[PDB]
Amino acid sequence: DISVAPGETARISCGEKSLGSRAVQWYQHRAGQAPSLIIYNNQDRPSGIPERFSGSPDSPFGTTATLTITSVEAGDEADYYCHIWDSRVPTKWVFGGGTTLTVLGQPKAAPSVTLFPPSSEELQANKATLVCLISDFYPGAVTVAWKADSSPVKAGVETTTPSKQSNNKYAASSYLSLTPEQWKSHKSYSCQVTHEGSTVEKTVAPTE
Amino acid sequence: QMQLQESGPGLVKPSETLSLTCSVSGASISDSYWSWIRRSPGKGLEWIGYVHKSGDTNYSPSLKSRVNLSLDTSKNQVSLSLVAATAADSGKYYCARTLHGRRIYGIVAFNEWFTYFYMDVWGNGTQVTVSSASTKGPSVFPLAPSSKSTSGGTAALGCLVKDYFPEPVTVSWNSGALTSGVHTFPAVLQSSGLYSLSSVVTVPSSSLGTQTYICNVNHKPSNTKVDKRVEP
Ligand SMILES: *[C@@H]1O[C@H](CO[C@@H]2O[C@@H](C)[C@@H](O)[C@@H](O)[C@@H]2O)[C@@H](O[C@@H]2O[C@H](CO)[C@@H](O[C@@H]3O[C@H](CO[C@H]4O[C@H](CO)[C@@H](O)[C@H](O)[C@@H]4O)[C@@H](O)[C@H](O[C@H]4O[C@H](CO)[C@@H](O)[C@H](O)[C@@H]4O[C@@H]4O[C@H](CO)[C@@H](O[C@@H]5O[C@H](CO[C@]6(C(=O)O)C[C@H](O)[C@@H](NC(C)=O)[C@H]([C@H](O)[C@H](O)CO)O6)[C@H](O)[C@H](O)[C@H]5O)[C@H](O)[C@H]4NC(C)=O)[C@@H]3O)[C@H](O)[C@H]2NC(C)=O)[C@H](O)[C@H]1NC(C)=O
């Protein structure tokens, strides 16, 4: 999983080192789109595929298949899969890679975090959900840890994967499901969102 | 040109048979090999198998016991059958024309070649969820007003739309009369098999006094319409 700025060159390794001889296919999977063949027979670009997309050559043995994208544009942000066929290695039924190329087509944006405590209504219903709402961050990769008081909480945590909001920034949700007991007992609960090294952490308390 | 369209029961109860259909238009299935590929939410692209009129047909060893690819020349369709489905069989399933090539790296004589396959044309894929989940309408909870996270003079309030199934839920606010500042987050698929989403709207803090905020959660799958008054 790698990020590059537009114009930068993306080199993507995938699969084991070559054993025998190979025909490596590359496929590009843009978010929501159908995948597309972008390289077959190690280096051959299908009709349509821009010269920016080069594949790695078959030999020497022990080579790692490598997709090179030069002069990267936004349209290149996708998952990239190699499908390796090696003469001395059985046919891969699972495409290697899934290496997510992120094209940083805009500057890093800090995540806005909103944290809602359990509603009374929810507690009345003998349930408790902490809602962490994360928005307007870029790139679209956050990490969300919950803390009861200051101890990390394993269970109850369901976090969405990020998703582009309309302003091309990303949004995410994390829910912490609790029993009303769990909630009423700890002095606080914290939604800690880590994005791009920095961390925002909201806290709520049953006393509200 | 060639276009592919996977279709089939988007939802399948565990142990039931996942059957998908790739409808090919503007090309004969008989002119190509055909693969099914799934992207399992877990790990990326699993080539499910391929099938030709030839009878040159093979299945992912992990699926060989359960899967049946199949061509219907008259219906012009590739078909996938995955019996005894489980949650692991959830994913987006792509149909793809599979082309092939010889990689000739030594001499044919010494058998120093092999046939490789590759998919030039993919269908959009059809999402398939294998879930024990039955249609469940949402508990809708008010997310009472909170200024901590918003800009000055404003506060966020929301509706937590909890434990519904299947997708989707629609949330509007004050019957669409409030669109400004509304952020309906995409749902989360929980361990429960159930979805929850939240929709927050950011409003004038001044207005909490007077403006009534009702989120109108609509979850047609269960014919449930909830209109939560969200009070401070
Ligand atoms: C496989 O997947 C592919 C690709 O999937 C896509 O890509 C993925 C990654 C993801 O993004 C998916 O969402 C994508 O779908 C898929 O193929 C796609 O299919 C999509 C829809 O199925 C298409 O979506 C369209 O995209 C265009 C933009 O396209 C550009 O970018 C595309 C994607 O980014 C790209 O593909 C293209 O290359 C291109 O560069 C978008 O603009 C379209 O949006 C319109 O349509 C949707 C509904 O279809 C609608 O929700 C939108 O609001 C919008 O509707 C139009 O809205 C405008 C502005 O509001 C209206 O303009 C006004 O029109 C009025 C007319 O008034 C009416 C009236 O009410 O009175 C309308 C009446 O019904 C009508 N009455 C009659 C009898 O006709 C009349 C009449 O028109 C006139 O009055 C007669 O005089 O009036 C006035 O003209 C106003 O002045 C005017 O402002 C429009 O009218 C309104 N029109 C429509 C049609 O509703 C849309 O989203 C993708 O492009 C497409 N991609 C490709 C490559 O094909 C594919 O399906 C999958 N394969 C299969 C088959 O499985």
Q: Which residues on adjacent β-strands are paired with residue A82?
A: A26, A96
The pick from A28, A30, A33, A77 for probing ligand 1's pocket by mutation, whose C-beta has the most ligand atoms within 8 angstroms, reads A33
Domain identity same for A148 and A72: no
Q: Could A95 and B101 be called an inter-chain contact, meaning their C-beta atoms sit closer than 8 Å?
A: no
Q: Where are the beta strands (DSSP E) in B52-168?
A: 58-59, 67-72, 77-82, 91-104, 113-122, 126-130, 139-146, 154-164
- Of residues B61, B62, B118, nearest to A25 (C-beta): B118
Residue A73 phi, psi (nearest 5): -115, 175
> The tokens of B224 are what?
């449930």
Q: Can you tell me the distance from the alpha carbon of A147 to that of A187, in angstroms, rounded to the nearest whole number? A: 11
User: Which residues of chain B neighbour A133 with C-beta distances below 8 Å?
Assistant: 149, 156, 158, 183, 185, 198, 200
Domain identity same for A16 and A73: yes
- Of residues B47, B143, B196, nearest to A95 (C-beta): B47
- Of residues A20, A119, A177, nearest to B142 (C-beta): A119
Q: In what order do the strands lie in the sheet with A151-153?
A: A151-153, A143-148, A189-195, A198-204
Residue from B22, B120, B121 whose CB has the most chain A CBs within 10 Å, to mutate: B120
- Of residues B62, B142, B198, nearest to A133 (C-beta): B198
Q: Sign of torsion, CA A41 A46 A49 A52?
A: positive
Residue A142 sits at the chain B interface (C-beta within 8 Å) = no
Q: Which residues on adjacent β-strands are paired with residue B121?
A: B97
Q: Can you tell me the distance from the alpha carbon of B80 to that of B70, in angstroms, rounded to the nearest whole number? A: 7
Domain identity same for A24 and A70: yes
Domain identity same for A80 and A110: no
Q: Sign of torsion, CA A160 B85 B128 B43?
A: positive
Domain boundary among the residues A64, A79, A105 is at A105
Q: What share of chain B is helix, strand, coil (3-state, %, to 5)?
A: 10, 55, 40
B157 exposed, middle or buried (CB, 10 Å; 0-12, 13-18, 19+)? buried
The bridge status of strand A64-69 relative to strand A10-17 is: antiparallel
Domain identity same for A124 and A181: yes
Q: Can you tell me the distance from the alpha carbon of A96 to that of A29, in angstroms, rounded to the nearest whole number? A: 13
Q: Could B46 and A122 be called an inter-chain contact, meaning their C-beta atoms sit closer than 8 Å?
A: no
Distances (CA, A) of A77 to A32, A33, B101: 12, 11, 28
Domain boundary among the residues A105, A131, A149 is at A105
For residue B93, what are the contacts with CB-CB under 8 A and spacing of at least 6?
A: B6, B8, B20, B36, B37, B38, B48, B80, B125, B126, B127, B128
Question: Collapsing DSSP states into helix, strand and coil, what is residue A137?
Answer: strand
Domain identity same for A88 and A165: no
Return the CATH number at A116.
2.60.40.10
Domain identity same for A18 and A46: yes
Interface of A with B in 9-38 (CB under 8 A): 20-23, 25, 27, 29, 33-37
Omega before residue B166 within 30° of 0, cis: yes
Residue A1 sits at the chain B interface (C-beta within 8 Å) = no
For residue A120, what are the contacts with CB-CB under 8 A and spacing of at least 6?
A: none
Q: Could B105 and A20 be called an inter-chain contact, meaning their C-beta atoms sit closer than 8 Å?
A: yes
Q: Which residues on adjacent β-strands are paired with residue B143?
A: B158
The pick from B4, B22, B124, B126 for probing ligand 1's pocket by mutation, whose C-beta has the most ligand atoms within 8 angstroms, reads B124
Atom of ligand 1 nearest to the CA of A31: 9
Q: Which domains does chain B have, with CATH numbers?
A: 1-132 (2.60.40.10), 133-231 (2.60.40.10)
> The tokens of A19 are what?
């054993």
The bridge status of strand A157-159 relative to strand A170-178 is: antiparallel
How many domains does chain A divide into? 2
Report angle CA A191, B149, A159 to the nearest 5 degrees.
35
Domain identity same for A159 and A101: no
Q: Which residues on adjacent β-strands are paired with residue A40?
A: A44
Domain identity same for A80 and A138: no
Residue A50 phi, psi (nearest 5): -60, 150
Q: Which residues on adjacent β-strands are paired with residue B199?
A: B159, B184
Domain identity same for A196 and A168: yes
Domain identity same for A86 and A173: no
User: Which residues of chain B neighbour A114 with C-beta distances below 8 Å?
Assistant: 146, 148-150, 156, 200
Q: Can you tell me the distance from the alpha carbon of B192 to that of B162, in angstroms, rounded to the nearest whole number? A: 11
Question: Collapsing DSSP states into helix, strand and coil, what is residue A57?
Answer: coil
> The tokens of A10 are what?
């993306």
User: Which residues of chain B neighbour A37 with C-beta distances below 8 Å?
Assistant: 118-120
Residue A141 domain boundaries: 106-208
End-to-end CA distance of chain B: 57
Domain boundary among the residues A105, A129, A147 is at A105
Q: Sign of torsion, CA B55 B59 B61 B66?
A: negative
Contact B52, B33 (CB under 8 A): yes
- Protein residue with least CA distance to atom 7, ligand 1: A33
Domain identity same for A8 and A32: yes
Contact B145, A119 (CB under 8 A): no
Experimental method of this PDB entry: X-ray
Q: Can you tell me the distance from the alpha carbon of B6 to that of B22, in angstroms, rounded to the nearest whole number? A: 4
Nearest to A116 by CA among B197, B224, B206: B197
